[PDB]
Amino acid sequence: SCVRDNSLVRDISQMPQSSYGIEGLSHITVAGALNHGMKEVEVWLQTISPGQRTPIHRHSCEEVFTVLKGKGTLLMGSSSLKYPGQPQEIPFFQNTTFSIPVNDPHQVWNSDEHEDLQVLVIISRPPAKIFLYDDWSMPHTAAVLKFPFVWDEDCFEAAK
Amino acid sequence: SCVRDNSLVRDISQMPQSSYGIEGLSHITVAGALNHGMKEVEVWLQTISPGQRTPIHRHSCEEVFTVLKGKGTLLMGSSSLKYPGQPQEIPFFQNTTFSIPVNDPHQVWNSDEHEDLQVLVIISRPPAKIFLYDDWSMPHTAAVLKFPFVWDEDCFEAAK
Numbered sequence: 001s002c003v004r005d006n007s008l009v010r011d012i013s014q015m016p017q018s019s020y021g022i023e024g025l026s027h028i029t030v031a032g033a034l035n036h037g038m039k040e041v042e043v044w045l046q047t048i049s050p051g052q053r054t055p056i057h058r059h060s061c062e063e064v065f066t067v068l069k070g071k072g073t074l075l076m077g078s079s080s081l082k083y084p085g086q087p088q089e090i091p092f093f094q095n096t097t098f099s100i101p102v103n104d105p106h107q108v109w110n111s112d113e114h115e116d117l118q119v120l121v122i123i124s125r126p127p128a129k130i131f132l133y134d135d136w137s138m139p140h141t142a143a144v145l146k147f148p149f150v151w152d153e154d155c156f157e158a159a160k
Numbered sequence: 161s162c163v164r165d166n167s168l169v170r171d172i173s174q175m176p177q178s179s180y181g182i183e184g185l186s187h188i189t190v191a192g193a194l195n196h197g198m199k200e201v202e203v204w205l206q207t208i209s210p211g212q213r214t215p216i217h218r219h220s221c222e223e224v225f226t227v228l229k230g231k232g233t234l235l236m237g238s239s240s241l242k243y244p245g246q247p248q249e250i251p252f253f254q255n256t257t258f259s260i261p262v263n264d265p266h267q268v269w270n271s272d273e274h275e276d277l278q279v280l281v282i283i284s285r286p287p288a289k290i291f292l293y294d295d296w297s298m299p300h301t302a303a304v305l306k307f308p309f310v311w312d313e314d315c316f317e318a319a320k
């Protein structure tokens with residue numbers, strides 16, 4: 001569904017959450033472009049189950065994560081050579097933050113075997129324009145744009 | 161002193177908090193322009209003590225709040241009158257979100273007597289350009305710009 005709501009105070013617990021077909025994910029856009037009218041920043045609340053990973057991807061915007069619960073590993077590559085290259089792998093834990101430089105290819109993995117990972121994610125220039133890589137050797141020109149992304153599809157179609 | 165941190169993954173409990181001379185405030189810039197190099201978004205973590213309030217102010221950027229703990233009241237003024245005017249009082253509670261229209265005058269109040277209010281705040285176009293009002297009756301044209309703001313003064317002076 002597309003749930004639009006521009007009032008000023010909104011209850012996060014009442015904004016319908018979904019995996020959008022991504023196994024192990026639970027997503028809520030807390031404040032965003034297509035659902036609420038934002039123009040410069042957008043905020044997501046996401047929970048990833050044990051062992052799950054996001055796809056390898058990039059987006060031409062700033063992006064900041066804050067870890068509410070759980071632990072994991074951040075994988076990041078470079079945006080300057082013709083492909084991402086073998087990534088940096090950096091562990092993170094509850095109450096850590098990390099920002100992804102514009103266009104850097106990255107992946108977030110919930111490497112804990114038992115607890116869910118819950119983060120707040122903030123982006124600039126919404127909505128997100130995510131290009132997907134199938135592995136760290138795929139060249140940057142070859143990444144596939146998936147726009148709108150699955151949590152924006154219903155509202156993107158409703159706004160034409 | 162100015163604390164600059166060029167690290168990718170940071171522990172938020174080790175970024176130094178301060179009131180910056182604002183009674184009942186505790187602030188940490190989680191990811192920002194002067195402290196970490198951000199250009200498009202900046203993220204703060206703020207705790208306000210029971211009864212305390214931010215000054216009445218406005219800023220030419222988007223601003224989104226997410227309430228992590230506690231509860232309170234958002235006070236919103238007019239951007240169409242020549243002054244903010246008597247404010248609308250909008251209650252908010254744990255797990256709510258609110259976005260402040262660009263340039264609207266507002267104040268956040270911890271109207272709870274029992275527990276601290278903690279919020280994650282996101283702004284666009286950092287660092288903040290905050291104009292202060294002495295009361296809801298002050299004309300928009302008389303509001304005073306305080307730049308750099310108190311949590312940016314040390315790095316702004318160090319930058320020279």
Ligand SMILES: *[C@@H]1O[C@H](CO)[C@@H](O[C@@H]2O[C@H](CO)[C@@H](O[C@@H]3O[C@H](CO[C@H]4O[C@H](CO[C@H]5O[C@H](CO)[C@@H](O)[C@H](O)[C@@H]5O)[C@@H](O)[C@H](O[C@@H]5O[C@H](CO)[C@@H](O)[C@H](O)[C@@H]5O)[C@@H]4O)[C@@H](O)[C@H](O)[C@@H]3O)[C@H](O)[C@H]2NC(C)=O)[C@H](O)[C@H]1NC(C)=O
Nearest residue numbers: 095172173177178179183184185186187188205206207209
């Ligand atoms: C991730 O890590 C984060 C960082 O560690 C965590 O957030 C922090 O959580 C702390 C633990 O709960 C939390 O500590 C509480 O701070 C509040 C809020 O504080 C201020 O006001 C206090 C109370 O005030 C009044 O009385 C005073 C005398 O009693 C008067 O002086 C005053 O004017 C007023 O009327 C003040 O005592 C306090 O003041 C000072 O403290 C500053 C340091 O904060 C100094 O700069 C200053 O000189 C002086 O020492 C504050 O201004 C308290 O009310 C409460 O009892 C705890 O101290 C802290 O605030 C949180 N930080 C932020 C930025 O939010 C977070 O929880 C972690 N999250 C996860 C998921 O793990």
Ligand SMILES: *[C@@H]1O[C@H](CO)[C@@H](O[C@@H]2O[C@H](CO)[C@@H](O[C@@H]3O[C@H](CO[C@H]4O[C@H](CO[C@H]5O[C@H](CO)[C@@H](O)[C@H](O)[C@@H]5O)[C@@H](O)[C@H](O[C@H]5O[C@H](CO)[C@@H](O)[C@H](O)[C@@H]5O)[C@@H]4O)[C@@H](O)[C@H](O)[C@@H]3O)[C@H](O)[C@H]2NC(C)=O)[C@H](O)[C@H]1NC(C)=O
Nearest residue numbers: 012013017018019023024025026027028045046047049255
């Ligand atoms: C502020 O409000 C927030 C919103 O209410 C709240 O955050 C919510 O908190 C709840 C409670 O803790 C969380 O619920 C937890 O969700 C996790 C993770 O869920 C996802 O993964 C599970 C497990 O997946 C895998 O295992 C299954 C087998 O069981 C496989 O099929 C699968 O492939 C994987 O291997 C999965 O079952 C979930 O899927 C279902 O649910 C989604 C909806 O989320 C449907 O769309 C889907 O079709 C299906 O029914 C999902 O993919 C779960 O494991 C836990 O058991 C528990 O349910 C929410 O995740 C969380 N929401 C967000 C967005 O983070 C805040 O906590 C609250 N905060 C405060 C301060 O109060």
Ligand SMILES: O=C(O)Cc1cccc2ccccc12
Nearest residue numbers: 022025046054055057108130
């Ligand atoms: O922008 C990010 O890194 C978040 C993110 C981007 C793309 C796909 C995702 C799937 C599941 C969870 C998060 C995801």
Ligand SMILES: O=C(O)Cc1cccc2ccccc12
Nearest residue numbers: 182185206214215217268290
């Ligand atoms: O509404 C805001 O921009 C945050 C904010 C702006 C100005 C002063 C403040 C004092 C204490 C806590 C937050 C404050």
Ligand SMILES: [Zn+2]
Nearest residue numbers: 057059063106
């Ligand atoms: Zn990303």
Ligand SMILES: [Zn+2]
Nearest residue numbers: 219223260266
């Ligand atoms: Zn403000």
